[PDB]
Structure formats: C-alpha cells, structure tokens
C-alpha cells in the first residue's frame, strides 16, 4: 500500500506523445487542465485533446489548456507542501536537500521528460524536466508553486531529459 | 501621407505591445493548478478574463 497508490494513480493520467513511435513527453491531468513541457514537439494520442486549442509559454516551457467535463475523474489534489523527504516518482525514490531535487545516477535517461512528481500522500507536487551529473548523484529541474505563480529552479549546467 | 503612416504605425505598435503586456500580465496565472484570477490584485486592469 506504500507505492501501490502511486502505480494506481499513474494509470489514466499520463498520456503518450510521439512524433513517429518516439515517445518524447507525457501529459498530466490535474488542476482542471493539462500540463506538458513546451520545449518538445509532438502530437497527443487522444483525439479529443488534439482538437482543443492550447496556450504556450516562452521561457517557462509549460502549457495550460481547459479540459472538458467527460474526464473529471482523473484529477489529483494539487496542494503544496515543502518538507525534506522523498516523493518516489515512477522510477526510484527522490532525494531532496537544500532546495534541490536530486536523483541517483543511472535512474533516468534523456528523452524521458514529462513524468510528474507527487508527494507520498497521493498529491501532485511538480513536473520533472531533466538534470545534470555531478558525482554519484544527478540534479533535477522542476517547477514549484505556492497556490500560484509557478517558478522554475534550474541549477547551473542542468540538462533536460 | 507620411504623417498618416507615422500615426498608424505608432498605434499599431502600441496595440501590439499592449497585447504582449496583456500576455505577460497573467500567463503564469493561466497556469498553476486550480486557483483563480487574483481579483484583489487585478479584476480588469489588464483584461484578465475569459468567461469564468
């Protein structure tokens, strides 16, 4: 029951985007809206998500668009807490220290952006982009909010997956 | 004709940069999960509404 909730809520939330069989970015479903990294191109798998218009961001490389009312059963809790603990995304746990998200080296690879990060209480926290290798651990790059005003945190030399 | 061209280009540039300023006003508040227009910060100071 520890990470079973994680894999259960992973389904029906992450959506597939691929140019030609090349999965690049994944789309989340929380906040009565859809987010994705705008730096990477592609097409959504679901036909309904394709026709609806969508916004665009210049430097925050995020995106917001309204979702209709026939998928209201796939929304998370979206409340912000900032402890110093773990958040166990789809591959491995998550190490956080000094305001930085940190992963073990080899736990991720390029071309794997779009995986959301959510606290162990089944509550979404942020969206992962990528990181860079310094020693036995690799940094991350995510976006964090306090009820509003999403803000980025990219250490020097970071590199998005 | 030169005066008319100057005034029309000035008004067009002003409108375009008003549009850019409008985008920069609350493109972050279009984002964020849940939440609403700040209201107490801006109700119609930058036309930040689209239905509800």
A148: closest CA of chain B, how far (Å) = 5
B40: closest CA of chain A, how far (Å) = 14
Token pair for residue A36?
């994705």
Number of helical H runs and strand E runs in chain B = 1, 0
Q: Nearest residue of B to residue A54 by CA position?
A: B30
Known active-site residue A86: no
Query: How determined?
Result: cryo-EM
Q: Say if residues A33 and B33 touch (Cβ distance below 8 Å).
A: yes
Q: Say if residues B30 and B10 touch (Cβ distance below 8 Å).
A: no
SS3 of chain A: the string is CCCHHHHHHHCCCCEEEECCCCEEEEECCCCCECCCCCCCCCCECCHHHHHCCCCCCCCCCCCCCECCHHHCCCCCCCCCCCCCCCCCCCCCCCEEECCEEEEECCCCCCCCCCCEEEECCCEEEEEECECCEECCEEECCEEECCCCCCEEECCCCCCEC
Closest of A137, A146, A88 to residue A117, by C-alpha: A88
Known active-site residue A39: yes
């Amino acid at each position: 029951k520890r990470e079973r909730m994680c894999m259960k809520i992973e389904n029906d939330c992450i959506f597939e985007v691929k140019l030609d069989g090349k999965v690049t970015g994944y789309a989340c479903l929380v906040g009565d809206k859809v987010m994705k990294p705008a730096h990477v191109k592609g097409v959504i798998d679901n036909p309904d998500l394709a026709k609806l218009t969508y916004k665009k961001s210049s430097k925050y490389d995020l995106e917001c668009a309204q979702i209709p009312v026939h998928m209201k059963s796939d929304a998370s809790k979206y409340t912000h807490e900032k402890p110093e603990g773990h958040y166990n995304w789809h591959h491995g746990a998550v190490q956080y220290s000094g305001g930085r998200f940190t992963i073990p080296t080899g736990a991720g690879k390029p071309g794997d952006s779009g995986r959301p990060i959510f606290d162990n209480k089944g509550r979404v926290v942020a969206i992962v982009l990528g990181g860079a290798n310094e020693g036995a651990r690799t940094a991350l790059s995510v976006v964090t909010w306090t009820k509003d005003m999403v803000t980025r945190y990219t250490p020097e030399g970071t590199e998005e997956w | 004709s030169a005066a008319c061209l100057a005034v029309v280009l000035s008004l067009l540039a002003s409108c375009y940069m008003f549009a850019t300023a409008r985008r920069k006003c609350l493109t972050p508040y279009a984002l964020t999960p849940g939440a609403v227009v700040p209201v107490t910060l801006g109700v119609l100071c930058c036309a930040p509404r689209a239905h509800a």
